[PDB]
Amino acid sequence: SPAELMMLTIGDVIKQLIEAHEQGKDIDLNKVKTKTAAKYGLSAQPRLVDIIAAVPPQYRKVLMPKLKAKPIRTASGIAVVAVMCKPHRCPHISFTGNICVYCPGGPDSDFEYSTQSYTGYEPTSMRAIRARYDPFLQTRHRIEQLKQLGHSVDKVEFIVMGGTFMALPEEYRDYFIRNLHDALSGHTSNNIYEAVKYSERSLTKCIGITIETRPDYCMKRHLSDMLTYGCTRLEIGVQSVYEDVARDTNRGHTVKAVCESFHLAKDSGFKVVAHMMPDLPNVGLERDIEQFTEFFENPAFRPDGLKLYPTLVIRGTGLYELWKSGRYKSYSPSDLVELVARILALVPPWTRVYRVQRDIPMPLVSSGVEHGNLRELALARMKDLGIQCRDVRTREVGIQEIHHKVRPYQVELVRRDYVANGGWETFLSYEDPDQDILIGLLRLRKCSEETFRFELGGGVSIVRELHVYGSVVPVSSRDPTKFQHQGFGMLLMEEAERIAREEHGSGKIAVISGVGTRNYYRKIGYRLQGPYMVKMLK
Amino acid sequence: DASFKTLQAGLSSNHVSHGEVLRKVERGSRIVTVVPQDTKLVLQMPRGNLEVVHHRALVLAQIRKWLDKLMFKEAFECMRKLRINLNLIYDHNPKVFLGNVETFIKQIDSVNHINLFFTELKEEDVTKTMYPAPVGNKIDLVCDAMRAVMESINPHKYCLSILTSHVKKTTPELEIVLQKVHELQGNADAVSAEEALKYLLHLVDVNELYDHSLGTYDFDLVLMVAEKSQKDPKEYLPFLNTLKKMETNYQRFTIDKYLKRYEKAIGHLSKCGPEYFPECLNLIKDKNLYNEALKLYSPSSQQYQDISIAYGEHLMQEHMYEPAGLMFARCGAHEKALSAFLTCGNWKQALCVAAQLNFTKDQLVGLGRTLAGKLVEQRKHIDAAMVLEECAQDYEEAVLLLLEGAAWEEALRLVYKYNRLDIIETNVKPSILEAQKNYMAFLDSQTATFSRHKKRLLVVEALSEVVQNTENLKDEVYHILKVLFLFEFDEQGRELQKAFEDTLQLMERSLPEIWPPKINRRTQWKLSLLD
Amino acid sequence: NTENLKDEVYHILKVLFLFEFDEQGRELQKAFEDTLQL
RNA sequence: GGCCCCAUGGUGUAAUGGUUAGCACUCUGGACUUUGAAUCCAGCGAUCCGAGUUCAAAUCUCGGUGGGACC
Numbered sequence A: 001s002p003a004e005l006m007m008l009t010i011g012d013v014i015k016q017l018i019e020a021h022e023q024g025k026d027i028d029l030n031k032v033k034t035k036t037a038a039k040y041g042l043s044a045q046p047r048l049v050d051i052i053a054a055v056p057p058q059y060r061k062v063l064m065p066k067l068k069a070k071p072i073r074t075a076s077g078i079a080v081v082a083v084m085c086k087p088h089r090c091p092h093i094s095f096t097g098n099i100c101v102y103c104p105g106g107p108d109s110d111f112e113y114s115t116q117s118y119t120g121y122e123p124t125s126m127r128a129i130r131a132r133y134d135p136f137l138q139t140r141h142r143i144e145q146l147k148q149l150g151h152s153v154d155k156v157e158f159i160v161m162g163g164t165f166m167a168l169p170e171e172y173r174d175y176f177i178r179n180l181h182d183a184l185s186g187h188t189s190n191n192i193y194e195a196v197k198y199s200e201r202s203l204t205k206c207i208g209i210t211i212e213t214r215p216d217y218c219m220k221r222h223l224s225d226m227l228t229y230g231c232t233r234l235e236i237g238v239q240s241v242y243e244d245v246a247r248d249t250n251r252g253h254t255v256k257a258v259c260e261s262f263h264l265a266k267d268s269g270f271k272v273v274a275h276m277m278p279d280l281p282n283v284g285l286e287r288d289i290e291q292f293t294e295f296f297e298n299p300a301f302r303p304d305g306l307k308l309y310p311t312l313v314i315r316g317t318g319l320y321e322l323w324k325s326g327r328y329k330s331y332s333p334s335d336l337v338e339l340v341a342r343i344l345a346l347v348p349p350w351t352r353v354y355r356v357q358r359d360i361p362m363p364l365v366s367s368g369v370e371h372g373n374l375r376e377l378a379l380a381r382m383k384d385l386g387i388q389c390r391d392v393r394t395r396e397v398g399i400q401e402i403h404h405k406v407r408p409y410q411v412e413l414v415r416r417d418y419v420a421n422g423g424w425e426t427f428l429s430y431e432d433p434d435q436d437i438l439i440g441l442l443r444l445r446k447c448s449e450e451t452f453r454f455e456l457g458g459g460v461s462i463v464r465e466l467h468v469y470g471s472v473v474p475v476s477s478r479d480p481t482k483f484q485h486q487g488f489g490m491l492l493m494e495e496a497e498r499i500a501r502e503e504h505g506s507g508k509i510a511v512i513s514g515v516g517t518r519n520y521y522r523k524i525g526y527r528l529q530g531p532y533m534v535k536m537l538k
Numbered sequence B: 001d002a003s004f005k006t007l008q009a010g011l012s013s014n015h016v017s018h019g020e021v022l023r024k025v026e027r028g029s030r031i032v033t034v035v036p037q038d039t040k041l042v043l044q045m046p047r048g049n050l051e052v053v054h055h056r057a058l059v060l061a062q063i064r065k066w067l068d069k070l071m072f073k074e075a076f077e078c079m080r081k082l083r084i085n086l087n088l089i090y091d092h093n094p095k096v097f098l099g100n101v102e103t104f105i106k107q108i109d110s111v112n113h114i115n116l117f118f119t120e121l122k123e124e125d126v127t128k129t130m131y132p133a134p135v136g137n138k139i140d141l142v143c144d145a146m147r148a149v150m151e152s153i154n155p156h157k158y159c160l161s162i163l164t165s166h167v168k169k170t171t172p173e174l175e176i177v178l179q180k181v182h183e184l185q186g187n188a189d190a191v192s193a194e195e196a197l198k199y200l201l202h203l204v205d206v207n208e209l210y211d212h213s214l215g216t217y218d219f220d221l222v223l224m225v226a227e228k229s230q231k232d233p234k235e236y237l238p239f240l241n242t243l244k245k246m247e248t249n250y251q252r253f254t255i256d257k258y259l260k261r262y263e264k265a266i267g268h269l270s271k272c273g274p275e276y277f278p279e280c281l282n283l284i285k286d287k288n289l290y291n292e293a294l295k296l297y298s299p300s301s302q303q304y305q306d307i308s309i310a311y312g313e314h315l316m317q318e319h320m321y322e323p324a325g326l327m328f329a330r331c332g333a334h335e336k337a338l339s340a341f342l343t344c345g346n347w348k349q350a351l352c353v354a355a356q357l358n359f360t361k362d363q364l365v366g367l368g369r370t371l372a373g374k375l376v377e378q379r380k381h382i383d384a385a386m387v388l389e390e391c392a393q394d395y396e397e398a399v400l401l402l403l404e405g406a407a408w409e410e411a412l413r414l415v416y417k418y419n420r421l422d423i424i425e426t427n428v429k430p431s432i433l434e435a436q437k438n439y440m441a442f443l444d445s446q447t448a449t450f451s452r453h454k455k456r457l458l459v460v461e462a463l464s465e466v467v468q469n470t471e472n473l474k475d476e477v478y479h480i481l482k483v484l485f486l487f488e489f490d491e492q493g494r495e496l497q498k499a500f501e502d503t504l505q506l507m508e509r510s511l512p513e514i515w516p517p518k519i520n521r522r523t524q525w526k527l528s529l530l531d
Numbered sequence C: 001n002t003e004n005l006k007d008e009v010y011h012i013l014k015v016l017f018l019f020e021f022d023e024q025g026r027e028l029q030k031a032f033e034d035t036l037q038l
Numbered sequence D: 001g002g003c004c005c006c007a008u009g010g011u012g013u014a015a016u017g018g019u020u021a022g023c024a025c026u027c028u029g030g031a032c033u034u035u036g037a038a039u040c041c042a043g044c045g046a047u048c049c050g051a052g053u054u055c056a057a058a059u060c061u062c063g064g065u066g067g068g069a070c071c
């Protein structure tokens, strides 16, 4: 059998490389791959997955630095895990049989198993289908699969899929959340609070969750509810900056409610990511440019997280027939490239882009662009125009090194501030300006005069979030060279505290945190109060 | 402190900038307000936000001010908060700085700060590398100099500082640090045992320190460190006891060979007993440590001569050449401590072997035959011309070899000494005439190839090679001319000279065209009778 | 220039190696080493 | 034992006296904060060995290596 022959080649490679390691000899993996394949009469190269699949642990301890696959999965600095909710119905349908004019198949839209705004062919979708949407099974399977690639899971985070979450029966969501927390804790519980207390002392060190929603479920009741879950960031879906479009799109709400939702959430202390929807009906190209410029020029919005999704006519929706009637037309691909290139030149430095384009399978869209890759095309176009972008994701150390191999040389501090939703926002960072490469960031502001949480009443400044990018470093490990444990955060904390004490003129500092991360602040003398970590300022 | 010329220079500098003066900014930037006494500047950008920056120049100026004004802590904090290199504090004035160590320590007076200061020492000076002025011994020296006084004032609550200071020396003196840890463990304000233990565990990545403890030649140290090594005592403890039981110097040899310190292993095993000497040989023949053992043993030792011949033979595999056979006839550093062995006999080791400790005389003329064949095959042809003098009267064969090698006057000496006059003209005269003819053939080929490749180059390297090939035969032709002229071949030699001169002029005139070596103009190849 | 002594002594070194003063080889080779850095 | 024939990426292959050996399977990376596997894009693989000749040689010669049928 050939299979045992490849196995023998694998063992040969293993012994050669461990021998090289013992004396510290350096060898090209591909070279020995080729030589072993030739000397054993192999017609095809060996897969690296199987190469990792046989190392003994007393060597996996140190061989991973030369064995990890697709390092970009940790090139940010934090592991990411996605989970799927049970399919259900959106609330608005209470009026008529309208989900959204552009939304894909929902619970009952000619799909055996699917979800609202999801065809059902995403790898996450098949994972959920096999898992029968069970949280625990799918999360264990996914984390195991990720660890197969020899990646540290010291710090992890959770993102939840699904159409709508706030609009679900409470007992179900509590069951779901406690199952998630028990997945990392390994301790069977009975309520949310028990799972919280147990996960406090776990070692997986969860650092937060983010959920999608819509402005209807944005009153302070739901915010307090989410405070009990440790959620950090939120998704809304804006789709426009013009009220008329909403009723044109049958969205079923007002942009105003979105604006007050933004203001209230920012006052509370969460983070928010918006969704932008270019090339819409009754929208000219100049309309798109103007509205996108407005999206940052207005102090009303000035959001933090940005996501973009170009229009995609798909069978089943009303827009399918509208285009089919030859009345809704898209742009040429060059037009889209120019649009994106212009947009990227406009992003303020603090904002971070997370994704571009949808992940829908190709042979389904009546106007789907050929290119699965668009950011690269935009990059080519903006090289052609000789104008650069300043997105966070494009100036962190991880991506910049993995795509250009540039080493920071002189890192310094930088401070900026602006106004948004009435807030006195403030942004701090360490970064190297000459290469414009960034390492660490912090977002801190003064709380608004009107608030929902009385714990913030008077002399209180909230620090929304703090983060240093890079790659995962185990909490016990100190220096694999790199930049994740040099004490950088300490300086930012002390300086932010000093600013709040003097410039803010407050009297007590509060902060949101992940369930595990609380212990970190304990090292600085921060004590708990409700769901908020806090320190007295006098 | 600038001038119109200075300012205009710093402004334009042919639009070339370098160092602390320039600083990149963003598009659409402006200026709002400078902040002296805090070294800031604030500006507005078009989108409608603010920006505050600390430019280097002001910060460095104030740092120099403070260093001259000696408040070290203020510069220290203002300089660490901005993520600036610490080494500059020494670099600014290394001499005077050393005279204020205690004052600096009292200025800092914080263990964590001293620890962080130690963990970033570097040899190079950034004032000459990273922070230009706008106008090995050092690290250990400063480390010990400050450690002495800081231990003097307080060792008890600054023990970890001492630990790091000795750890961060040029070489890791882990042994003494382990000694301090163990003695503190034995002893009962001051730092405790587990405290320093953890304070070093992260610092050392224990397993290497465990190996070093093995090297330190003490079991108890190995015991404590291995307590945290997580390895099964069922594994190493029987092995450790086995090592303990066996002999002291043999313990040393075995621990060095287990720690690859082969030099110490051989040093120990040399005195551990002569009976193990051959085994040592194997190691120093497996690890090629012959030269090392040369110092361990002494002359007049059979071990010394054996290891010498081992050096000359085993390492010289594929190198049975001048060094091998040479020091074989030498048996090492001694001049002639061995004989009766020659590898190839390159005219020197052969006669050295044969004559010194004379085994076979040239009456056993096989040596002459081998030398002649070998070196003549090596295009020498003088080997026979010398050895056959000591050998039989085959002078005529020597004459033939000299003629093949163009050694004319030596053939003349042989013919006029051995009275072999019959061969005065039978073969040498046509041979040298043919030599002139083939000289013409080769010269014509050189001319043709040179012209061809020069034209090929001119269509749009190796020409210089042929050029240098042509200049080698000047005096060869010169003496061949007179050699022929005794037989009065002045016409053929004149042809030779004319062809050589024409080719010489061809390359001489082509040389400026191409541009590149320079030939010599003091080569004589012409004769007045020839001319 | 000095290239004549580049190999000459480097092959006349033997007259000293063939004696007991092997250590002296480097003790002169330094000069032959020095000109290497021109 | 000779005659012949063959030796190009890890494999399947084009190509040929001159500035670059082209494809194909395979493997690797990014798009991707939904994907090792998908879609696209990008990238890493090479003339059996030694002697010859030829300005120049994988293609002309010889030798060797190993393999393939002949009586």
Ligand SMILES: CCNC(=O)CCNC(=O)[C@H](O)C(C)(C)COP(=O)(O)OP(=O)(O)OC[C@H]1O[C@@H](n2cnc3c(N)ncnc32)[C@H](O)[C@@H]1OP(=O)(O)O
Pocket: A077, A078, A155, A205, A207, A208, A466, A467, A468, A475, A476, A478, A483, A484, A485, A486, A487, A488, A489, A490, A512, A513, A514, A516, A517, A519, A520, A521
């Ligand atoms: C709030 C939810 N979001 C996140 O947590 C984002 C991910 N967080 C991180 O990657 C890191 O915590 C940071 C971004 C803060 C970078 O770490 P940073 O360099 O600032 O830490 P410092 O170097 O200043 O301090 C080091 C200490 O932090 C400790 N530490 C690291 N991670 C954690 C953690 N989850 N919880 C508690 N302590 C931690 C380390 O054990 C270390 O202690 P040590 O004395 O034994 O070395």
Ligand SMILES: C[C@H]1O[C@@H](n2cnc3c(N)ncnc32)[C@H](O)[C@@H]1O
Pocket: A102, A103, A104, A117, A236, A237, A238, A239, A275, A276, A277, A309, A310, A311, A312, A314
């Ligand atoms: C997730 C974000 O993408 C939008 N969205 C969901 N499905 C589609 C689709 N087929 N086409 C365009 N936008 C879509 C949602 O309305 C939300 O804004």
Ligand code: MET
Pocket: A117, A162, A163, A164, A212, A213, A214, A215, A235, A236, A237
């Ligand atoms: C998945 S669509 C975006 C989130 C949510 N369904 C909304 O439209 O508000």
Ligand code: SF4
Pocket: A090, A099, A100, A103, A104, A116, A117, A163, A164, A214, A237
């Ligand atoms: S609210 Fe969002 S998920 Fe629900 S139907 Fe509309 S677009 Fe789809």
